[PDB]
From a paper:
Consistent with this view, the most polymorphic region, identified as the DEK epitope, is positioned immediately adjacent to the conserved DARC-binding groove.
To overcome this inherent deficiency of DBP as an immunogen, a novel synthetic DBP-II antigen termed DEKnull was engineered where the polymorphic residues that comprise the DEK epitope were mutated to amino acids not usually present. We obtained the crystal structure of the DEKnull antigen to a resolution of 2.1 Å. DEKnull maintains the overall fold and conserved disulfide bonding patterns of a DBL domain similar to that found in P. vivax DBP Sal1, from which DEKnull is derived. All cysteines in DEKnull are involved in disulfide bonding and are structurally conserved with Sal1 DBP-II. Alteration of these amino acids to ASTAATSRTS had no affect on the secondary structure nor do they shift peptide backbone Cαs. The dimerization and DARC binding surfaces overlap well with the parental Sal1 DBP-II; there is no allosteric change to secondary structure or peptide backbone Cαs, retaining the conformational shape of protective targets.
Author numbering: 2 to 40, 49 to 256, 258 to 295
Write the structure that this text describes.
């Protein structure tokens, strides 16, 4: 059904339990791969066949993402295009980090086509780099259909096709989720735990629904911290898999680039529950 409609963003939080070395976004789980899953001639013909199947899945993915975006054509939509396109790329290149269920089937199908010799990985990257512009076009079809020649400037093609390791992109995506969730969770804390100027005891000291709001906030921030540690640890593993090391980029550098107002110290305080706002609202001491 993931090729029929998308869950609301953040309806399901990042999943770190299924594959323990990485946290997987719901968007990735829902990536449309129907045609890719449902995959004799020369290998050249079969690659051509693959392209067309990838175009179909990409077109559907872009259509459902736009519907999820309620046809707004805003930054959220363009990010989703970039994330999903990127994931398609990693699937094609064989560097996707999910590799469960039908993703495993898809990887088997691609290996039937490209083989598994020592040149396979390179030729798979070559095929993607040669094809990715058309896949973006396929993903943007639903936009082209409604906006015609003006679809070109809704989202940036170049940004979308520029190759980046999957864990880089997922950290960007995760960060955008975090900054969307944070004020929302702080709202709930404030509403239940906010105090008048002349209070004597914090509400959290003895007021049950404030305590339960703090408990619930604790559960959320504990997930966020867990997710950040897992993704950060995966960032290190993926980096160390690179034969040559770039002499340094950290996950915070990525967050700093993706996010508007990022502040590493503030961020680290929040996920460790030692920020001023949390302490004010949830620590009775």
């Amino acid at each position: 059904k993931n090729c029929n409609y998308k869950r609301k963003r953040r309806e399901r939080d990042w999943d770190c339990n299924t594959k323990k070395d990485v946290c997987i976004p719901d968007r990735r789980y829902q990536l449309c791969m129907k045609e890719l899953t449902n995959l004799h001639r020369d290998i050249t013909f079969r690659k051509l066949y693959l392209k067309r199947k990838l175009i179909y899945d990409a077109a559907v993915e872009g259509d459902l993402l736009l519907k999820l975006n309620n046809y707004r054509y805003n930054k959220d939509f363009c990010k989703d295009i970039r994330w999903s396109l990127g994931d398609f790329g990693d699937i094609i290149m064989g560097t996707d980090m999910e590799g469960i269920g039908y993703s495993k089937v898809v990887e088997n199908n691609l290996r039937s086509i490209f083989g598994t010799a020592s040149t396979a990985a390179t030729s798979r990257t070559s095929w993607w780099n040669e094809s990715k512009a058309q896949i973006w076009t396929a993903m943007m079809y639903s936009v082209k259909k409604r906006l015609k020649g003006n679809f070109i400037w809704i989202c940036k093609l170049n940004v979308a096709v520029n190759i980046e390791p999957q864990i880089y992109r997922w950290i960007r995506e995760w960060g955008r989720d975090y900054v969307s969730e944070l004020p929302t969770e702080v709202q709930k804390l404030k509403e239940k735990c906010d105090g008048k100027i002349n209070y004597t005891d914090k509400k959290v000291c003895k007021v049950p629904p404030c305590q339960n709001a703090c408990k619930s906030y604790d559960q959320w921030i504990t997930r966020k911290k867990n997710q950040w540690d897992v993704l950060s640890n995966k960032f290190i593993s993926v980096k160390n898999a690179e034969k040559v090391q770039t002499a340094i980029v950290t996950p915070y550098d990525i967050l700093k680039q993706e996010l508007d107002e990022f502040n590493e110290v503030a961020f680290e305080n929040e996920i460790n529950k030692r920020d001023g706002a949390y302490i004010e609202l949830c620590v009775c001491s």
